[PDB]
Write a protein that binds this ligand. Structure first.
Ligand SMILES: CCCCCCCC/C=C\CCCCCCCC(=O)OC[C@H](COP(=O)(O)OCC[N+](C)(C)C)OC(=O)CCCCCCC/C=C\CCCCCCCC
Ligand SMILES: CCCCCCCC/C=C\CCCCCCCC(=O)OC[C@H](COP(=O)(O)OCC[N+](C)(C)C)OC(=O)CCCCCCC/C=C\CCCCCCCC
Ligand SMILES: CCCCCCCC/C=C\CCCCCCCC(=O)OC[C@H](COP(=O)(O)OCC[N+](C)(C)C)OC(=O)CCCCCCC/C=C\CCCCCCCC
Ligand SMILES: CCCCCCCCCCCCCCCCCCOC[C@@H](O)COP(=O)(O)OCC[N+](C)(C)C
Ligand SMILES: CCCCCCCCCCCCCCCCCCOC[C@@H](O)COP(=O)(O)OCC[N+](C)(C)C
Ligand SMILES: CCCCCCCCCCCCCCCCCCOC[C@@H](O)COP(=O)(O)OCC[N+](C)(C)C
Ligand SMILES: CCCCCCCCCCCCCCCCCCOC[C@@H](O)COP(=O)(O)OCC[N+](C)(C)C
Ligand SMILES: NC(=O)OC[C@@H]1N=C(N)N2CCC(O)(O)[C@@]23N=C(N)N[C@@H]13
Ligand SMILES: *[C@@H]1O[C@H](CO)[C@@H](O)[C@H](O)[C@H]1NC(C)=O
Lengths: 1417, 173, 119
């Protein structure tokens, strides 16, 4: 109704009420396009000038019945209300209600309130506000009250259906104003929480911006889809926490107490009388610089304690007492911390020091199962949720666009000009582009030459270089400025960018602006992005940024709002506590490095939690503000922030890397002038080649073949390969013995020497054999044989240089360290390792291009960091205390050396990883992007005054902005791009070999398909009913759902009784828990016995029954064997490992939830690929472990290299490497390897019992080692993540309903028997047209059936006849579709047919129905 | 780091010989003040007599003529925290055969604590006329050789067998 | 340090006057370091007379002006340092001050009560 505009009038209201009375005397959905909040369809055209912003009668007929009226604003916005008087006082016609309507829907009605809200926000971030803020608070409350009044003055309170209180956002603003008035006009007390209540005003932003309600709705939906994963996470965490509580209850209370006490004292009296930190240090051994006492241990592979101290289990736990497995609640906390890998290396090392190092096997399984797998499950489920929602949304938008198009179709049916053209011909794009881009790259390489200890000549050289580049840039700017119309020049965005940069540079030149050189450097550096026109990946990163700020800007805005809100609330609740309770978290009674006492630091803490580091800040917070609130706040932050962040991340991934969805460009108008110039120069150089070659010409045997075949037969035989694999394993295992303890076992030493000789001989013989059979050409045209050749040649060179005698000659000693490559010879043998190795090489080209982009972006950042922090990190520390000097004394380097001369224990010490040149810049950036060691760099950065001036506390406080911007554009955006290119490459690979798995060997593929069959079998036989009346009646009682439910409830209670065991429990509780366990065991055995009497021998059919029987057996044997271990034998460690059996029954809870079972089944189905990748990873761990031992075994025990966790033995090296496989703590291990000069090391230190001297490591090899290792491990775990995500995507989508019941199979035959009374199983194609028309639904096919019957591609046997199963399979395929079981059902039906009719001669198909009709036409 | 290794037991007459006595501390980061004594009874007599004592970077040697000269220090130099009490014999004679006792007397330094410890190490020294090569060395060398020979023989045997087989089969066609 | 006292306390002659004083210090009260001084002046610009002090244990100075009518009536570990003046006399009118130090808490607390004696 284009001309359906009608002022809502009393007569209209009378008609409404009349029709309503008509309806009520006699006793559909709203059109979503006319629904309020949306935009008016154009089918109504423009609005009459007197009709807009005025009560109009309802358009939608759905509401045309009920008492309703709408209004449209000057922006075609639809607004519904109710015609019932508001609070039975205001008729819609009344002028007051009209004016309130006029005010309400108005474009100044959002902007007003939004500006007020933003000012209120900027006023909330005030630590101690002045007294203007009182009046400002009053005025804010007044504006909010005014708005709420206008709203409840044109919508009604709750009298009808379009009223104020209906919308939940109105609930929010309502309670806001209620609390405001309460606080301001009652003024009771505890104003902290009351003022925190006033942060909900910030939430009103979400109600005043158009795109912020849809976003939170989508977030809520994505959360709602996480029920099963939340359940499984809680369950797995609880099970592992029970395990850890059993194995580690009270271990972390082990400190070593002094053996010799004086004056008749004991442990009890002492622990009763001491309360300090010094007094504790007098009796317990404390490592210098540590708040927590040294964890001793009772075993032999546990941390040892100094002579004069015995390990005893007394006192509080470390970390103020917040880390222990003493109670389920603290064990659950510790394991949640382990799942997120937050500072978990410390818990690792603390548990391996109190308990034995054999206890690491627990950490391996926990890390892998919990962290890796659970987090992958979370990512997979969130990605599925988001993907589908986005897909549905885009599809709906497309449908709406189509409808709109259809409706549109329905509606339709002097000298200046001279030198200007001169220079524009001179702009010469095919070459000047190359000129200027080479100039840009030269400028970038030129600014990357600064370092700290430069000389003046280099300084002025850099000066003239910068000036020359600036002049060239300004010259090109002014040329293009005049050549193109200045208006046209300015039109182009890139030219705006260039002009901005050049103008900033010139401003820097002219006046004294040298102060802020940061901006100069930054702006001329950003120029590198001009290469994005000819570089696809850089362009892709730019698009990922553009998408995040201009297509998903609302999601980013929501993220910013949430971070702001969390920062504000953190300041209000916890800020005062840090000032008041400061001495409890710090020894100098000054605020720590991370607090919440003002808005900036609160925001920084929220950012840290978003990055992943939350445990440490939280301990200080619990100390100053109680456990309850601190826990609640931090957990809300963690979960909600991470949810929003992952949502933003995945949105970027999908939107940006939807290249197929964004490929609509036409033919490239101009292949980049790089290509044009390349062709031009190629033509020119070919010309020059031709003319120059012209000028040059002008100026001037039956035994041998048998031997070959014999050697082939040998070197291809299975015995031979098995023997060589055995020799490989033996050789590799012999490398694990040359630890620092090799001098204690001399016989093994000699044995290993001669075994090395034998191995070398065997491998040389094998190499010669390979050459004889394979031949020289085939042997050298491989990548494996070259590896074997290199390895054996290195070994042979070492051998010959040792037998000759000229050993220890310079490089020969180093070449011996390459024996740690011998394990690499196993890659060519194990197909499992080989498949993943060849997969990784396929990814190398794609990653390399991205690695390059990442490097350029990091160079842009590292050059900035060099310009900001070049050599400002030197500090005049006190060596003994490791403490920086107050900087009030010792202001500069000269004063620090003047101190050195008089005192003795001071140093002008630089940081180890600094920004003194682009190399150390790259290293520091890596540490920052991995959040390991980032804090130490940041503290110095923000503490830096100048080049030789002593650092001062928080002088450059806002330098944190540098690291924030980095972590956002480096770590976040680069990782996004990386994941995108990787998934695209892997999709292309999987497609390339024809849609198959890339991580499994051919043998595993069959195992995988068989294990897939175990999912949803579906043919079900009944369990037999007992003949005996008595047994049968009880059998009926045994198989009721009630019995099962009761058993599940008992299992849940058993778990609860396990959870209540703590440390220091009284004997009473011990006994009663013992007896409750006894009773549970008895009832479980009983339930099993009862089923074995009712179920007879059919019990061992269901696998879960077998599991039940096994767990019953294990439980009872554990109980009795424990009772025998107590009163006969003595073993504490084995006792608890035995009692671990009772956690078996808890697993029976899986039998209930059909949701968790799918997830565990996916995990199981993704095991083989994980196994192969784990093998490759273990091999890499082994090679690195051997290199590490050989090169670092004698480094200084400084930080991360303790008495345990070193590279002195193979086990220790493996423990260290497994740790840093998760990148945790690699900064710690790398640090002591960077000492290479005195007084950081001693190169002439004699090691008792050896002949090696220096205690410091070669920095270059150390760096290379660690960085390469973390990179390779990152690649491997990315592969693992991809494997798990693919398998989950598969499993979740495998099945379909298959609602065809057996009766639908019978009716197929009863109709078959009417056309084939001879049971020949062959029907004529002519009869197919009617057979498909005689079937009942769903197998019914209506006439004309032939159009579909041809398209089903039925095969035809000789005589133009078709088989029964051919027709049956085509029909079930039509109702079910193409599911994973469809190819499986076709398999089982065929094999059941092959075993029944061995007459295969009559089954050959000669043609198909689609091919037959093509022959017909 | 510090590794406790056992000393050799065979001294070639007329030559030099180094006697090892290494005693690592439990924790390396602690600091102590060590000193030691050595005591030796001659093979064929039963009485342990002191021969030397090392403390404050000085070796005080008892006046026993059997060890007049012929003995020098080999442990830690200028450390006061020895962790290595080896001594070196020059010009070994036949009188140096017997049992050796290496008493350590460590003194750890702690926060408010001083633990005067003590360890004892014993060594047996037999003086031979010529260094007899180890049994393990010779048996390992012989095993190396015989393994080489047997694997080579199996190789050549399979080689000749397969060669005859293939040459007969190719002529069969 | 937040110290809570009544700014004015009106008590009948002859009754017992509890001078309430509590203080919100987060750190636990260590009796070996906690310090309390309860002084009394006649006017804001007059001399203060210490009458009770917590040093290791409650020390009642037994000032002649109070006879033996002063008693401690608090519990330092519960953050209460109140005093009791039994059988109040007209001469007890004046200003009473609760000074508080709770190491390692940095800030010293001060409460001031104006005691008025009614007929
Ligand atoms: C959106 C919503 C997101 C979730 C929000 C809510 C999530 C969690 C709320 C947890 C509330 C905890 C309340 C604890 C109350 C309490 O105060 O209880 C006291 C107990 C025991 O303290 P104590 O007596 O030994 O004190 C002695 C002090 N000492 C030993 C340190 C010296 O404290 C304890 O057990 C510590 C208990 C820690 C429990 C783990 C917290 C959950 C972690 C991860 C959950 C997954 C996310
Ligand atoms: C998304 C990105 C992820 C990538 C992660 C990268 C991680 C970090 C990589 C490398 C960090 C270490 C780089 C080397 C550090 C060198 C520090 C240094 O002290 O430098 C100085 C030396 C010169 O010595 P001198 O001044 O004492 O000379 C003595 C003569 N006198 C005194 C008279 C002048 O210069 C040298 O040796 C420099 C030798 C090496 C130069 C490398 C320059 C940077 C280029 C690439 C780094 C990134 C690697 C990319 C591949 C991996 C992926
Ligand atoms: C610290 C904790 C210490 C206590 C632990 C106590 C329990 C530990 C080990 C007990 C293992 C006992 C054997 C478990 C497998 C039993 C079994 O018979 O499993 C069979 C299934 C395949 O048989 P089905 O289910 O298709 O049987 C057809 C019948 N139908 C389809 C109707 C269900 O194979 C599979 O998935 C095998 C999956 C096996 C996973 C074992 C993980 C143990 C953790
Ligand atoms: C300091 C020393 C550091 C040295 C590091 C050396 C690392 C060596 C890594 C070897 C990494 C593995 O070597 C490359 C081979 O995989 C090449 O073989 P392909 O997979 O390309 O062969 C194709 C497979 N078919 C088609 C022939 C079957
Ligand atoms: C804890 C580790 C979990 C272990 C569970 C393993 C998954 C489950 C292991 O069993 C899966 C079977 O269903 C595979 O079926 P088939 O073995 O019958 O396939 C035929 C193979 N042949 C006979 C052709 C060679
Ligand atoms: C991170 C570490 C992840 C380790 C995962 C360990 C799983 C350790 C258990 O492996 C899981 C098995 O179901 C599959 O093992 P396979 O891949 O060997 O199965 C194939 C069977 N055939 C074909 C070889 C005979
Ligand atoms: C699959 C891997 C199977 C092997 C796992 C690694 C075993 C690795 C076993 O390492 C053996 C030793 O080198 C360990 O030495 P510790 O650091 O425990 O100190 C011992 C000190 N004494 C007693 C020698 C003096
Ligand atoms: N200082 C620093 O980088 O802070 C981050 C966090 N805190 C520590 N004390 N760590 C010990 C070593 C380390 O790598 O720096 C780290 N270990 C993990 N997992 N994150 C680090
Ligand atoms: C051990 O004694 C020999 C011979 O006197 C001496 O040359 C060498 O320097 C000593 N070595 C040590 C480790 O003290």
């Amino acid at each position: 109704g284009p001309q359906s505009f009608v002022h809502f009038t009393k007569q209209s209201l009378a008609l409404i009420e009349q029709r309503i009375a008509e309806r009520k005397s006699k006793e559909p959905k709203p059109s979503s396009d006319l629904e309020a909040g949306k935009q008016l369809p154009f089918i109504y055209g423009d609005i009459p000038p007197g009709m807009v912003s005025e009560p109009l009668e309802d358009l939608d007929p759905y509401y045309a019945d009920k008492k309703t009226f709408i209004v449209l604003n000057k922006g075609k916005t639809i607004f519904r209300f109710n015609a019932t008087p508001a609070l039975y006082m205001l008729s819609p016609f009344s002028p007051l209600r009209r004016i309130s309507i006029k005010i309400l829907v108005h474009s100044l009605f959002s902007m007003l309130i939004m500006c007020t809200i933003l000012t209120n926000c900027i006023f909330m971030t005030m630590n101690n506000p002045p007294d203007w803020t009182k009046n400002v608070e009053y005025t804010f409350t007044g504006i909010y009250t005014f708005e709420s009044l206008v709203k409840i003055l044109a919508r009604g309170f709750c009298v009808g259906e379009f009223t104020f209180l209906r919308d939940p956002w109105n609930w929010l603003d309502f309670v806001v104003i209620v609390f405001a008035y309460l606080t301001e006009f009652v003024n009771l007390g505890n104003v902290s929480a009351l003022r925190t209540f006033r942060v909900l005003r910030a939430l009103k932003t979400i109600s005043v911006i158009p795109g912020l309600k849809t976003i939170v709705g989508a977030l809520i939906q994505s959360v709602k889809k996480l029920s099963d994963v939340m359940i499984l996470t809680v369950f797995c965490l609880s099970v592992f926490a029970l395990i850890g509580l059993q194995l580690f209850m009270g271990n972390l209370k082990h400190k070593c107490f002094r053996n010799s006490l004086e004056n008749n004292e004991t442990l009890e009296s002492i622990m009763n009388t001491l309360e300090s930190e010094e007094d504790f240090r007098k009796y317990f051994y404390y490592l210098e610089g540590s708040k927590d006492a040294l964890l001793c241990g009772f075993s032999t592979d546990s941390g040892q304690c100094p002579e004069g101290y015995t390990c005893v289990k007394i006192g509080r736990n470390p970390d103020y007492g917040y880390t222990s497995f003493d109670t389920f609640s603290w064990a659950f906390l510790a394991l949640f911390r382990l799942m997120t890998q937050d500072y978990w290396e410390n818990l690792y090392q603390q548990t391996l020091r109190a308990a034995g190092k054999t206890y690491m096997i627990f950490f391996v399984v926990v890390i892998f199962l919990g962290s890796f797998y659970l987090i992958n499950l979370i990512l997979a489920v969130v990605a599925m949720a988001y993907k589908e929602q986005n897909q549905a949304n885009i599809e709906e938008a497309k449908q709406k666009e189509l409808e709109f198009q259809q409706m549109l179709d329905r509606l339709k049916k002097p000298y200046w000009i001279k030198f200007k053209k001169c220079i524009y011909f001179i702009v010469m794009d095919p070459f000047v582009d190359l000129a200027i881009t080479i100039c840009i790259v030269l400028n970038t390489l030129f600014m990357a030459m600064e370092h700290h200890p430069m000389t003046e000549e280099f300084k002025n050289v850099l000066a003239i270089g910068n000036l020359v580049f600036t002049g060239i840039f300004a010259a090109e700017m002014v040329l293009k400025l005049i050549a193109m119309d200045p208006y046209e020049y300015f039109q182009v965005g890139w030219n705006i960018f260039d002009s901005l940069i050049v103008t900033l540079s010139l401003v820097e030149l002219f006046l004294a602006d040298v102060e802020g050189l940061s901006v100069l450097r930054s702006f001329r550096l950003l120029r590198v992005f001009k290469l994005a026109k000819s570089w696809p990946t850089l362009n892709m990163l730019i698009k990922i940024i553009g998408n995040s700020v201009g297509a998903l800007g609302n999601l980013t805005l929501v993220l910013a709002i949430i971070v702001f809100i969390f920062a504000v609330v953190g300041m209000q609740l916890f800020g005062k506590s840090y000032k008041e309770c400061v001495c409890k978290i710090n020894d100098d009674c000054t605020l720590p490095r991370w607090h919440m006492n003002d808005f900036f630091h609160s925001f920084l803490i929220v950012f840290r939690v978003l990055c992943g580091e939350w445990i440490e800040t939280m301990w200080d917070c619990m100390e100053v503000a109680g456990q309850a609130m601190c826990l609640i706040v931090y957990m809300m932050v963690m979960v909600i922030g991470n949810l929003v962040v992952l949502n933003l991340f995945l949105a970027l991934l999908l939107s940006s890397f939807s290249s197929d969805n964004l490929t609509a460009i036409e033919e490239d108008p101009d292949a980049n002038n790089l290509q044009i110039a390349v062709t031009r120069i190629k033509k020119g150089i070919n010309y020059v080649k031709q003319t120059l070659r012209e000028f040059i010409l002008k100026a001037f045997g039956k035994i041998w073949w048998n031997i070959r075949k014999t050697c082939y037969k040998i070197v291809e035989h299975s015995w031979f390969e098995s023997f060589i694999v055995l020799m490989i394993l033996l050789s590799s295992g012999a490398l694990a013995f040359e630890d620092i303890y090799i001098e204690r076992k001399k016989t093994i030493k000699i044995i290993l020497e001669y075994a090395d000789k034998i191995f070398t001989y065997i491998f040389i013989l094998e190499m010669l054999l390979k050459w004889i059979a394979y031949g020289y050409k085939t042997y050298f045209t491989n990548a494996w044989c070259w590896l074997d050749f290199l390895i054996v040649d290195v070994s042979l060179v070492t051998l010959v240089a040792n037998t000759l005698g000229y050993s220890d000659l310079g490089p020969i000693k180093s070449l011996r360290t390459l024996r740690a490559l011998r394990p690499l010879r196993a890659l060519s043998r194990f197909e499992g390792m080989r498949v993943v190795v060849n997969a990784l090489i396929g990814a190398i080209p794609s990653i390399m291009n991205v690695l390059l982009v990442c490097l350029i972006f990091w160079l842009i950042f590292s050059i900035m960091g060099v310009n900001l922090f070049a050599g400002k990190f030197y500090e005049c520390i006190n060596t003994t205390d490791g403490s920086r000097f107050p900087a009030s004394q010792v202001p500069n380097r000269s004063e620090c050396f003047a101190l050195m001369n008089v005192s003795q224990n001071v140093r002008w010490k630089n940081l180890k990883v600094n920004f003194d040149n682009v190399g150390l810049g790259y290293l520091s950036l890596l540490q920052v992007a991995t959040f390991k060691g980032w804090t130490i760099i940041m503290y110095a950065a923000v503490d830096s005054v100048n080049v030789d001036k002593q650092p001062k506390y928080e002088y450059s406080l806002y330098m944190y902005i540098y690291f924030v911007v980095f972590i956002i554009f480096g770590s976040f955006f680069t990782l996004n791009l990386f994941i995108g290119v990787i998934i695209d490459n892997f999709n292309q690979q999987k497609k390339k070999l024809g849609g198959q798995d890339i991580f499994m060997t051919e043998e595993q593929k069959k195992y995988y398909n068989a294990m897939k069959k175990l999912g949803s079998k579906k043919p079900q036989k009944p369990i037999p009913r007992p003949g005996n009346k008595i047994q049968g009646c009880i059998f009926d009682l045994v198989t009721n759902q009630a019995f099962d439910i009761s058993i599940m409830v008992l299992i849940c209670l058993n778990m609860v009784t396990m959870m209540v065991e703590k440390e220091g429990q009284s004997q009473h509780m011990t006994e009663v828990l013992y007896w409750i366990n006894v009773v549970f065991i008895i009832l479980f055995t009983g339930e099993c016995v009862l089923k074995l009497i009712s179920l007879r021998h059919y019990y061992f059919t269901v696998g879960w029954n077998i599991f039940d029987f096994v767990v019953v057996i294990i439980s009872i044997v554990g109980m009795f064997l424990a009772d025998l271990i107590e009163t006969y034998f003595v073993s504490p460690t084995l006792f608890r490992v035995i009692r671990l059996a009772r956690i078996g029954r808890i697993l029976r809870l899986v039998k209930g939830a059909k949701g968790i079972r799918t997830l565990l089944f996916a995990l199981m189905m993704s095991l083989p690929a994980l196994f192969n990748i784990g093998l490759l990873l273990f091999l890499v761990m082994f090679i690195y472990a051997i290199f590490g031992m050989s090169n670092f075994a004698y480094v200084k025990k400084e930080d991360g290299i303790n008495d345990m966790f070193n590279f002195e033995t193979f086990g220790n090296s493996m423990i260290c490497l497994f740790q840093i496989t998760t990148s945790a703590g690699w900064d710690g291990l790398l640090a002591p390897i960077l000492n290479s000069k005195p007084p950081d090391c001693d190169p002439k230190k004699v090691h008792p019992g050896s002949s090696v001297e220096g205690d410091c490591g070669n920095p270059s090899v150390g760096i290379f080692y660690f960085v390469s290792y973390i990179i390779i491990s990152f690649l491997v775990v990315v592969n693992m993540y991809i494997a798990v995500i693919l398998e989950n995507f598969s499993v979740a989508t495998e099945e379909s309903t298959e609602p065809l019941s057996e009766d639908d199979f019978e009716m197929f035959y009863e109709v078959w028997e009417k056309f084939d009374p001879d049971a020949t199983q062959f029907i004529e194609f002519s009869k197919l047209s009617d057979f498909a028309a005689a079937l009942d639904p769903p197998l019914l096919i209506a006439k004309p059936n032939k159009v579909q019957l041809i398209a089903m591609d039925l095969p035809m046997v000789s005589g133009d006849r078709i088989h029964c199963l051919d027709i049956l399979f085509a029909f079930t395929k039509r109702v079910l579709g193409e599911s994973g079981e469809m190819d499986s059902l076709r398999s089982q039906m065929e094999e059941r047919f092959m075993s029944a009719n061995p007459s295969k001669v009559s089954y050959e198909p000669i043609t198909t129905t689609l091919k037959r009709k093509q022959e017909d036409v | 780091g510090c590794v406790e290794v056992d000393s050799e037991t065979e001294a070639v007459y007329g030559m030099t010989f180094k006697i090892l006595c290494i005693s690592c501390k439990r924790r390396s980061e602690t600091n102590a003040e060590t000193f030691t004594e050595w005591t030796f009874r001659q093979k064929g007599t039963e009485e342990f007599v002191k021969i030397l004592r090392y403390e404050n970077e000085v070796l005080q040697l008892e006046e026993d003529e059997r060890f007049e000269g012929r003995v020098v220090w080999n442990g830690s130099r200028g450390t006061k925290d020895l962790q290595d009490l080896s001594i070196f014999i020059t010009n070994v004679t036949y009188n140096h055969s017997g049992d050796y006792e290496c008493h350590v007397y460590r003194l750890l330094f702690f926060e408010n604590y001083e633990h005067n410890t003590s360890v004892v190490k014993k060594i047996h020294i037999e003086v031979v006329d010529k260094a007899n090569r180890d049994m393990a060395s010779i048996v390992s060398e012989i095993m190396m050789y015989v393994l080489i020979v047997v694997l080579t023989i199996w190789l050549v045997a399979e080689m000749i067998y397969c060669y005859k087989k293939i040459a007969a089969a190719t002529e069969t066609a | 340090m937040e110290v809570t006292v009544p700014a004015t306390l009106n008590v009948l002659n002859g009754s017992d006057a509890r001078l309430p004083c509590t203080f919100n210090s987060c750190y636990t009260v260590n009796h070996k370091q906690f310090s309390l001084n309860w002084t009394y002046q006649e006017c804001n610009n007059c001399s203060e007379e210490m009458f009770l002090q917590f040093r290791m244990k409650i020390i009642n100075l037994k000032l002649e002006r109070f006879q033996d009518r002063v008693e401690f009536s608090g519990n330092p570990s519960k953050y209460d340092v109140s005093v009791m003046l039994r059988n109040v006399q007209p001469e007890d009118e004046g200003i009473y001050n609760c000074y508080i130090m709770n190491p390692p808490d940095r800030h010293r607390g001060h409460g001031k009560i104006h005691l008025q004696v009614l007929m």
